[PDB]
Enzyme design. Sequence first.
Site, PDB file in Angstrom:
ATOM      1  N   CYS A 190      20.942  33.452 -30.503  1.00 50.54           N
ATOM      2  CA  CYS A 190      19.886  33.177 -29.520  1.00 50.54           C
ATOM      3  C   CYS A 190      20.070  34.145 -28.336  1.00 50.54           C
ATOM      4  CB  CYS A 190      20.009  31.736 -29.018  1.00 50.54           C
ATOM      5  SG  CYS A 190      18.500  31.163 -28.276  1.00 50.54           S
TER       6      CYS A 190
ATOM      7  N   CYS B 177      19.420  32.718 -24.967  1.00 48.67           N
ATOM      8  CA  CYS B 177      19.486  31.836 -23.812  1.00 48.67           C
ATOM      9  C   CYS B 177      20.685  32.119 -22.936  1.00 48.67           C
ATOM     10  CB  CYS B 177      19.398  30.371 -24.215  1.00 48.67           C
ATOM     11  SG  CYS B 177      20.606  29.894 -25.482  1.00 48.67           S
TER      12      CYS B 177
ATOM     13  N   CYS C 166      15.232  30.847 -24.331  1.00 44.74           N
ATOM     14  CA  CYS C 166      15.544  31.215 -25.689  1.00 44.74           C
ATOM     15  C   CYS C 166      14.667  32.309 -26.232  1.00 44.74           C
ATOM     16  CB  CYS C 166      15.571  29.995 -26.603  1.00 44.74           C
ATOM     17  SG  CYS C 166      17.070  28.987 -26.380  1.00 44.74           S
TER      18      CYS C 166
ATOM     19  N   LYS D 167      15.561  21.503 -34.413  1.00 43.46           N
ATOM     20  CA  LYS D 167      16.260  21.345 -33.141  1.00 43.46           C
ATOM     21  C   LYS D 167      15.320  20.682 -32.133  1.00 43.46           C
ATOM     22  CE  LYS D 167      18.064  24.235 -29.585  1.00 43.46           C
ATOM     23  NZ  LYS D 167      19.305  24.684 -28.889  1.00 43.46           N
TER      24      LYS D 167
ATOM     25  N   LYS E 164      19.636  19.095 -35.115  1.00 41.80           N
ATOM     26  CA  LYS E 164      20.310  18.833 -33.833  1.00 41.80           C
ATOM     27  C   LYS E 164      19.361  18.198 -32.834  1.00 41.80           C
ATOM     28  CE  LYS E 164      22.341  21.541 -30.091  1.00 41.80           C
ATOM     29  NZ  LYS E 164      22.419  23.041 -29.874  1.00 41.80           N
TER      30      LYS E 164
ATOM     31  N   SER F  78      26.904  17.798 -27.623  1.00 45.84           N
ATOM     32  CA  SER F  78      27.761  17.579 -26.475  1.00 45.84           C
ATOM     33  C   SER F  78      27.502  16.255 -25.786  1.00 45.84           C
ATOM     34  CB  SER F  78      27.607  18.731 -25.456  1.00 45.84           C
ATOM     35  OG  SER F  78      26.223  18.795 -25.093  1.00 45.84           O
TER      36      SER F  78
ATOM     37  N   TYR G 120      32.704  18.324 -31.935  1.00 44.12           N
ATOM     38  CA  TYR G 120      33.742  18.556 -30.950  1.00 44.12           C
ATOM     39  C   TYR G 120      34.936  17.617 -31.178  1.00 44.12           C
ATOM     40  CZ  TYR G 120      29.996  20.978 -28.569  1.00 44.12           C
ATOM     41  OH  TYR G 120      28.893  21.761 -28.265  1.00 44.12           O
TER      42      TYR G 120
HETATM   43 ZN   LIG Z   1      18.907  29.613 -26.979  1.00 42.80          ZN
HETATM   44 ZN   LIG Z   2      13.924  27.043 -21.713  1.00 43.94          ZN
END
Ligand SMILES: [Zn+2]
Ligand SMILES: [Zn+2]
Lengths: 326, 326, 180, 326
Positions: A133, A135, A143, A210, A249, A276, A315
């Site tokens: 990506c 971002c 993104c 996502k 996700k 997360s 994680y």
């Molecule tokens: Zn991104």
């Molecule tokens: Zn954005």
Amino acid sequence: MHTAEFLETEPTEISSVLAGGYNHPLLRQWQSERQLTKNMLIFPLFISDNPDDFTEIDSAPNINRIGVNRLKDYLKPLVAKGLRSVILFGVPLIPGTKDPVGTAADDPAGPVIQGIRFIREKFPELYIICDVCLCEYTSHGHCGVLYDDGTINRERSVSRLAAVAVNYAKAGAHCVAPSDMIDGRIRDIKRGLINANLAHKTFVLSYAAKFSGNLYGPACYQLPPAGRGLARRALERDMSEGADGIIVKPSTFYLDIVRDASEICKDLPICAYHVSGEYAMLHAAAEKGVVDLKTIAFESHQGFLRAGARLIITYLAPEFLDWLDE
Amino acid sequence: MHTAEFLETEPTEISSVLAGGYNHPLLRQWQSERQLTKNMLIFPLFISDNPDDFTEIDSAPNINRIGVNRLKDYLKPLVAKGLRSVILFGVPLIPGTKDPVGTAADDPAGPVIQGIRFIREKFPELYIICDVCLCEYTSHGHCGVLYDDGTINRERSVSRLAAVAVNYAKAGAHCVAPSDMIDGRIRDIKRGLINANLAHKTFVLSYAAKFSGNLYGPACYQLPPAGRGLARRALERDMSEGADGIIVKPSTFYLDIVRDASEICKDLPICAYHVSGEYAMLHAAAEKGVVDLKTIAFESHQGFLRAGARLIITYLAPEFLDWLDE
Amino acid sequence: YDDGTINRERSVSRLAAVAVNYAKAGAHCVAPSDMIDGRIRDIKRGLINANLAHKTFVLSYAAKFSGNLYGPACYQLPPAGRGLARRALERDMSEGADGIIVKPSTFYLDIVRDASEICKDLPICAYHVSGEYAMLHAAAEKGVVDLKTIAFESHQGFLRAGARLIITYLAPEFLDWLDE
Amino acid sequence: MHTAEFLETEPTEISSVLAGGYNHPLLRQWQSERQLTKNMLIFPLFISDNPDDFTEIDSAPNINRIGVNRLKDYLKPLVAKGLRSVILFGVPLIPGTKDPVGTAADDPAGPVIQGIRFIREKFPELYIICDVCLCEYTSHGHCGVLYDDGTINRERSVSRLAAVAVNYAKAGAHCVAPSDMIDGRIRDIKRGLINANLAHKTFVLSYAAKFSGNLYGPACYQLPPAGRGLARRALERDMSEGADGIIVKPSTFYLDIVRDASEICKDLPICAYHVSGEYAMLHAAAEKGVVDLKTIAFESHQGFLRAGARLIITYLAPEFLDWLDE
Ligand SMILES: [Zn+2]
Ligand SMILES: [Zn+2]
Ligand SMILES: [Zn+2]
Ligand SMILES: [Zn+2]
Ligand SMILES: [Zn+2]
Ligand SMILES: [Zn+2]
């Protein structure tokens, strides 16, 4: 006075009897479509610009921002304990790297490409996956490449993302995971790998579904939570465009979506992504004693497996690498 | 020096373009299989032996243990705000009521049957649902009548549960929700209602899929989390035995199961059950600022809807009755 | 029957008793391998009447074919009998089986695949027969193949075909190999 | 003392009675989806550079490496006994033929193309199939043209394989069976036949599912044994790319895969391939008296038929051509 009433009933029907199927602890393993192995977990890694880094991030995590110089002491115990895969997240900190075209994205001397070069030399056992990506490398933080003060420029973003993806593969990354959600990126990334003669050795792990939510942090292409039809069409698009595996996700709050991906993308490995915020919400609840972390982590992670996933990005790998030993 | 690379790509394919389907806030509502209305929520009620009660329970909740004398001031604001249904949980506290046969279960002067009589007189608008089990009325605390120092006695438990169910209906309960998980109880409860001539007016809301987990409290028939096949066979059994609706509990961690129930039990109303522990985990996470409660509650509850449920039993009804107003 | 075929009624009535007696003695699961029509129902009913149904897993040998895999050279499906095997799988589940067994396994992988769809919600079990085991060993010693290699391939085949359980004489070994 | 116990049972249900369907020897034939005919077998032939050859190969086989000069005495008894098809494998032995581009592959004077010319003149009844690959003609021994000290060069391998395939068809081969497993070869081989105006008369018998294993010899594109999803996607690819028939290799250990191909490729003839190692393992077991060869060969070969195949490539054709006579 009130006395216990007992209606009269007919003989039991065999079709009503399911209980002989789950009465012993072993039958509970017997009853699962798939069991949790250690080679199923994928540990996310946040690599810093500062080669000596090892800065604690925070929510409820126990995850850090490490640098190439601390990477060997951190992956050693993990690898010896059974870890077989990691997904790379580069974190460029130096005061003048981020820009409008995410130039630093495939920077041969950036955190990611240097994280790849280090791992393939010190841990040639590890399967390297890389998030793809812009971002984390664009000044705007979106993104993809934007239009003058507006929306995301599809064409330039994708053309840019295909390059980053081919550059990680050229640097040695076994797999690229595009997480932009930008229409058609999988096709261009797959075509680019083909032209770069790396298609037959780079697994494209698409973040097909996502969704946007409050699971990334308290408070660009991203499916709305109720968007089931879009999620299904995106799953099907990404597989037709070349994805070799799919990611959903978040995961716990989107188990029905992993179940849909398990039928739409039946012949491809599905991967759940314990976000997360979910991780940080399990930890919080735990400390407030609403639940027992180990207990809520096995339940939640077996849920991914039951829902259809055969891979899990979490994680909680360090822990699981311990718990599965038991 | 490192310069931004941009691969060349082919023209965009229309099949790759999904984005025109979700770009406006309104299109995000347009994209949902079903939207959250107020007549979809079902508020759980814990009725105490002590008619003046109103004792705070605890995890992260804001739910209480009320008594018939406080029940009118508690349901008034709720009913005026749009609440249309409640599910009754009796909590017998008096020092000498619980026993081996759950005798107090259908006690005409118990919390439940008195909760039913009160509601139908002060709030004839409210749809009364009643949980059906013996766990809260047996000295042992198990879901049914036990064998001498052993397992659950199927025959006596079911025969007992059918009676409790018919007694709540005879007292005026529009619906009975059996949550024992004991093989064949739905059939006996349905047969018993038939013989009692109450089958055509009592909706049997089966907890078809009730899994065991760490979502009830930190730390008898109950599906194991990985048990997907059992959950599916139990869904199908319960519908063949007479269930008019189905419940999946917990919900957020079992969204794939609600999706399965949405296909196996396609012609029946599915209900998700936001468990105390999930509710208490959303609250905790919220207070630790891992997420925003309202935000995480809409996301989680729209998840039930997206997964296939058209009804939701949650402790967040008071709130939702507010939020949907907005 | 007097100098003839198998007496269905007496055989089943007898098999239900043996099954309930093993459960009464403490056996967690009973695997009926007679192949006699309706035995699963009587064994399940008998466990119910004996109050042991909720704790005894009935592991049915739903598809047991006859072959030269038991020893060089009664109800038993003929090798080409796919439709019978499918109807037997469906019968046994409707009659109460909690799990299913396919025997032999390697030569009947398509049948385990069929059982994986007919009996999707039930644990499927593959049965690596003595003759298959004895044929892997022979081939091995004649160096046609490497035992460990041919055992992982064959046993992953059960898993790929749909089984989540495997009855094999190679467990001692596997308990070693999976350690690695 | 211990006496035989007999529980009491209910009347027999008709749904339990399957036995009237298989009680007579004839009903056992009646019960098969398809029966073994002689025109179903395909005999593999290994043609040597040395025109007078007839060298015994070894495992457990009874198969040889014959040369054009012995080919007529070898196929005569076979053809008279009912053999209708053969699949050609060229074995170039002359000290300076193999190279990096598999040049000798379509050598008009090689074993294969000379095997084709001989058969079509002495046995115009025989259906000629030819295996298409470069493994047996490249100095490296791999299935295709390699990159400098690395992986297989997709583009050059395929472009090369399309030529070999069109050359065998131009020499008179009714069918080409590509066994490289290289992505997209079917399309290029089909396109090449089209451009060569031979598409309407050359049956492309694709080895769609060729797994790697210890069945080729004790101890390049090849599906891993557990790879069911890849096998299914490869089956579907190859049919969309032009395959007119499909091959699954090995067969006995991959019966579930032939069953999958029987549903994915329902309208196309499926072919099972009894591999050398399976053949050699049946023979060994036989000699060690673990089983009876004829018995284990009918069982195994009826398994292909039951699993869905209507064609079988086996080294047991000579025998079967005898046994089916009986
Ligand atoms: Zn991104
Ligand atoms: Zn954005
Ligand atoms: Zn209960
Ligand atoms: Zn209990
Ligand atoms: Zn080859
Ligand atoms: Zn090779």
